[PDB]
Structure formats: C-alpha cells, structure tokens
Amino acid sequence: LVETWMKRVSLQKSAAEKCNVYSEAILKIDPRKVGTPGSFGRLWCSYGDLYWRSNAISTARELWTQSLKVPYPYIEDLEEIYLNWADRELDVERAFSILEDALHVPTNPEILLESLRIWSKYIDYLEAYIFNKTKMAYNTVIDLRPAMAENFALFLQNHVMESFQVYEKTIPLFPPEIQYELWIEYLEVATSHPEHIRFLFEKALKNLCSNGIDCKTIFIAYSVFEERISISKSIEILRRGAVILESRLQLWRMCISKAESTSVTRELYQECIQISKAVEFVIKFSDFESSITIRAREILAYGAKLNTELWDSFEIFELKXXXXXXXXXXXXXXXXXX
C-alpha cells in the first residue's frame, strides 16, 4: 500500500512519472489497488488529486477513471473522489450533478446491501444547496440508519409541522442517544408554540424510565410543561417522577426545589424526607417546618434522630425557648454519647 505512494511521492518532485506508476499498477487489476489495501486506500483518489493540481478536465477524467476502477470490500473509497469531484464541480449545477451521483450511490449501496459517511455528505449537499428533495434524502438516510440537523433546517427554511414530523422521526429513531432527542423535541415543541404535546411528554417519560440520566430534567420538563398549559398536582407529578439512586438524588433535589416553591407543602416535605440523602432531606423539611413552633420542633427532633450540621440546625431551631435550648444541649449530649 505504502510503496505506491512512496513512488508517487518521489514523482511529486517533478510532474506525473511515478504517478503513472501508480496508474499503471492500479489499472492492471483490482488486486493491486483494491486488493493491496485491506481497508480503504486513496490511490485512485491520489491520482485524481495529482491531475487536479495539473489540470481540471484531465483531473475530472482521471477521477472518472478512479470511479471506474471498482474498489474492494471497503467503505468510503469512491466517496472522497466524488467529494473532490463535487467541490471541484461547484468551484450549483456541477455540484448538483455530484449530488445526483450521490443519489445513485445511495440507491446502489442500499441495493447492494439488500455509504453512511457518504449518506451524511449527501445530506450536507442537499441541505446546503430544493427543500423537499433534501427532506427526501433525510427520509432515505433515516431508513438507512443527525435528526437534530433535520429539525434545525426544518425550523429555519419552513418558518412547527416540519419539526413535528422531525419530532416523529426522532421518536422513530429508537436508536441510542434517544433521551436527548426526545428532550430536544419537547423543548422545540414548547418554544415553537398542546395536549398532544403533553401526551408525547408522558410517553417519553414512561418509556425513558430506565435511562438513569436527566430524570430530574425530564420531570422539570413535564411539570414545567403543565405549568405552561395552566398546576400543584403537576408539582406532585414532578415530585412523583423525582420520587421514583444518584439520578434519584438529583430528582429529590428537584423535589426540594419544587416543594420550597410550594398542608400540601407539609405532605411533600414528609414524603421527600421519608424517602444519607434522607438526612439531608430531613434538614430540608425540618427547615420547612421552621417556616410552618411545637410541630416544627418535633420535626427537628426527628431529623436529629436520623452529623454536626444537624447540631447547627437544632441551634437555629432553638432561636425560633430557654427550655428548648436546654433540650438542644440534652439531645446534643445524647448524640455525642451514641
């Protein structure tokens, strides 16, 4: 593989001499260019580049020769020649021609199977270059299989119906990094503007329960969405989502946030507290009690019973009483004993 390119390198000092070596060696059979390289090898491509440096029509024709020279069991061999022929063509009718070529490739590669990088390139071409065709490519690409791009383009040129079916596409792309997709779609769906949306959100939630990643975020999205629509039962929805280990920790913090934003509040506090993190939660809800003197005190005591930051909390409570302070000393002493 390297020998040929070394010869070519030598040739590079002058015009095409050992470039013609490559040409000769590769043109004899597929085994010397396609078979020599186990993976993809830019020998034909190299030749084309050389010709490009030399001239334009000759380069296009040399390149054409490269295309004709069918590569081995390898991916992204003729795509770089078609890419250097696309850009070259453009440097938007010749570029379209390269896009047509790409279309053929897509048809031919898909057909062959029953090309991914190539597909991406095609998409880039059809999107950058009118809209419906690009959409078609997107669809094809999806089938073959990024959708974020589709959403973006759709959002831009068609300005949420293109991004609604784009949202559908995301949903339908049951492939990994799907939580993010769903989230993004949700975000777009609220900003582009409704009960359908809510339903979608619910679906996302129920299905993406074993994510263990942005569950708190998801909950926020839900509760937030509900709020936008409207309310306090939606805070319980968020709470629920958050209530259902370290993802759940984050969740519980979310719950705390919601609950501080909130009898019902008391209930929430009781829940969250009850559910090491638990101690912290206790501190939270104990504080809540402090806002809500006897009951609060009791709550504080309970929290304490569940280390030295708790002492501080107790002290604070005692501010909110001489007898209470005495109790604090007592309880603290007891704690020390334990």
């Binding site: 609604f164 559908e168 359908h196």
Partner: protein, 164 residues
Amino acid sequence: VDFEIRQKNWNGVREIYSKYVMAHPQMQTWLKWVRFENRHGNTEFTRSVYSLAIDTVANLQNLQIWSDMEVAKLVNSFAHWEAAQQEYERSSALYQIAIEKWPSNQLLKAGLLDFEKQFNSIEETISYKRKMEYETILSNYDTWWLYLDLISEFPKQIMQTFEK
C-alpha cells in the same frame, strides 16, 4: 427448540412450534415463534404465521383463551411487522377488523393510536387524551380531566360527564 436450533435444520422445528402452541396456547409462544421466523430468511412464512395466529384468535373469539392483553400485544406485534413490510393497507384493515371483531378496545385503541402517531394528529390527541381521562378517573386532576374532555369535545358527553 434451542436444541433443534443448535441442530442446524429449520424443518420439523416448524411442526414442533405448531405443537408448542397446541400444548401452550399462550401468546408468548406465538411471539417466540414469530421471533424465530425473524431469524429465518423467508419473510413469507413470517406473514403466514401472523395470518395463522390471527385466524386462530378469530376462530376462538369468545371468552375461552388469554385476556385482552395478550391479543392486544399480538396485534401490536403484527402491526409493527407490517410496518417494516410494504402493505400498510392490510394493517389498516386489520386494525378496523380488530376494533370491529373485539370490544373493550382500550389496549387495541392505544396500539392503533400509537401506530397512527408513528405513521390524524387530532385523532391521536383525542382518543389518547380521552384514555388519559379514563386513567385520570381511575386515579381520583379530575378537574383537569373534565376540562380536557370539554376542550377535546362529543360535547354532550363532555357536559354529561362534566355533570357526573
């Protein structure tokens, strides 16, 4: 089956699958069989198997098998197989047939709704939302339910159920 798959052949296995339904008329069995046919190259038999299963379900329609759940699951699976395949017309027909042949279509309707969403929007929001109201009712956001109904509607059922 595993033995008979570890055995390289894929005939006689078919017969035992057929018998494996005979002993265990369970939808899980059918689903497993379908999965096997998915491993199998000839897609014709996959569809054929689906046709068979559906036919059998039809024949023993009345309460003499599995619950609505299993049948719903089956219908869903079939629908998604067809979804991979060309003929969505037949899928649609099946769905209509399914709603026609089966009452108590919460599962069935749900599946149908999902398919519609995949493959209209108003309908989806409508039926799905209504289901959510039913779900809501089961929980008790009952106000939210009634409101939803009112918005979605039909309006006679909105005001009747509102009154209720």
